[PDB]
Amino acid sequence: CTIENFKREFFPIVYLIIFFVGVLGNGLSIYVFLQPYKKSTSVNVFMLNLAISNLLFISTLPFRADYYLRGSNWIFGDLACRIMSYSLYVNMYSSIYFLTVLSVVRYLAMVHPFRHVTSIRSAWILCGIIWILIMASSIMLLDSEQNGSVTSCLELNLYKIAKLQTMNYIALVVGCLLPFFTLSICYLLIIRVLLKVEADLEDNWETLNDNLKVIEKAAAQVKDALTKMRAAALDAQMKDFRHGFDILVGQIDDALKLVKEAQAAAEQLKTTRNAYIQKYLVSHRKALTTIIITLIIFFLCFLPYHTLRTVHLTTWKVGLCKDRLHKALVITLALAAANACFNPLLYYFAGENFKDRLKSALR
């Protein structure tokens, strides 16, 4: 079949591109992660696990490239071929779950921007669960260099066809479609919460500026406005935040009841309210960026690959090439592999003190 001629040129190129790009990206990302910083978070745990998985997988790519560069002749021994298969699939599904967990965590965080020792350890416990389950689910590959007159690895063949037809069925459903479903619900929930919270924040800021413009324009009415604002704040009852705001109000109302000092003190509420707003806004930015990048990764790297893989398995026959479908599969397999060098975009644009650690390293 002519696809083999296509493969022997196509795979070395993309595998080595992914190798070098991924070594640079992941090596630098892991170096940054491990830099000391005053605070740490569970999302750093999940990102670190993802980057380690990707770099381990990337370390296998020069061997696959060698395979194809030798005319599809494997020289590295039977165990190494087994490990090629195992590393490919363990990386793929560990990555999918680490991404899904990361999106879920960002949602749960944006719900509660203000309010633990335990969640750092919990992130490791969860990661360990994911590793155990995926590694145990994949050990089939370790139990199954086959060919004669040449040594062939990485190839679909009759011996394994039925096996993979069954295995696909589970990995398609639990390893791909269920996580993408979880992501789609997460997207819906992120958008809903973000829109509602920012509408509320705009209302809050607008009423504050109205009251402050009233105080700026017109001492008899200053006390009235301050008492109305104090009553509104008490009915709003972040105990320390409310107490700080109320203490601002009480200081202004004292400086009034004692016109220059009180009107000036009125402005101090504005900067504290802007910081209160910014905390929420940062949490929402992070969640939305994460979910968008992750959905794009899924559309590019994983769903086309699983679709074409499934159809390739279902229609496979011993003496037929199907070069066009097979070529499409080869390309989407490349994309799935390339996820391992794509993921540091997420570390850079949605990291947790990532740029802070990076600036520290630069110092």
Ligand X SMILES: Cc1ccc(F)cc1CCCCOc1ccc(C(=O)Nc2cccc3c2O[C@H](C(=O)O)CN3CCCC(=O)O)cc1
Ligand Y SMILES: CCCCCCCC/C=C\CCCCCCCC(=O)OC[C@H](O)CO
Would you count residue 66 as binding ligand Y (CB under 6 A)?
Answer: yes
Which residues lie closer than 8 Å to 137 by C-beta, 6 or more apart? 93
Would you count residue 329 as binding ligand X (CB under 6 A)?
Answer: yes
Residue 124's Cβ-count burial label (10 Å; 0-12, 13-18, 19+) is middle
14 touches which of ligand OLA, ligand Y, ligand CLR, none (CB within 5 to 8 A by kind)? ligand Y
156 touches which of ligand X, ligand OLA, ligand CLR, none (CB within 5 to 8 A by kind)? ligand X
Would you count residue 313 as binding ligand X (CB under 6 A)?
Answer: yes
> Given CA atoms 287, 289, 294, 299 in this order, what sign does their dihedral have?
positive
Report residue 207: phi and psi, to 5°.
-65, -35
284 touches which of ligand OLA, ligand CLR, ligand Y, none (CB within 5 to 8 A by kind)? ligand Y
Would you count residue 338 as binding ligand Y (CB under 6 A)?
Answer: yes
Q: Are 99 and 40 in contact (CB under 8 A)?
A: no
Size of the site for ligand X (CB under 6 A): 22
**Which residues in 184-221 are b (16+ Cβ under 10 Å) and which e?**
eebbebbeebbeebeeebeeeeeeeeebbebbeeeeee
Closest listed residue to residue 49, CA positions, set 29, 19, 35: 29
Scanning 68-76, 134-142, 191-199, 271-279 for contacts with ligand X by CB under 6 A, the matching segment is 134-142
> Given CA atoms 89, 93, 95, 96 in this order, what sign does their dihedral have?
positive
- Interface pick for ligand Y out of 62, 82, 311, 325 (rule CB under 6 A): 62
- x/- site string to ligand Y, residues 5 to 44, per CB under 6 A? -x--xx--xx------------------------------
- Cβ proximity to ligand CLR, 28 vs 191, nearer residue: 191
Angle between helix axes 354-362 and 3-33 (nearest 10 degrees) is 70
Scanning 6-14, 22-30, 155-163, 221-229 for contacts with ligand OLA by CB under 6 A, the matching segment is 22-30
- Interface pick for ligand Y out of 37, 76, 180, 276 (rule CB under 6 A): 180
The contact set with ligand OLA (CB under 6 A) reads 23, 27, 30-31, 34, 52-53, 55-57, 59, 87, 90-91, 124-125, 127-128, 131, 135, 168-169, 172-173, 177-178, 181, 185, 189, 191, 195, 198, 289, 295, 310, 314, 345, 349
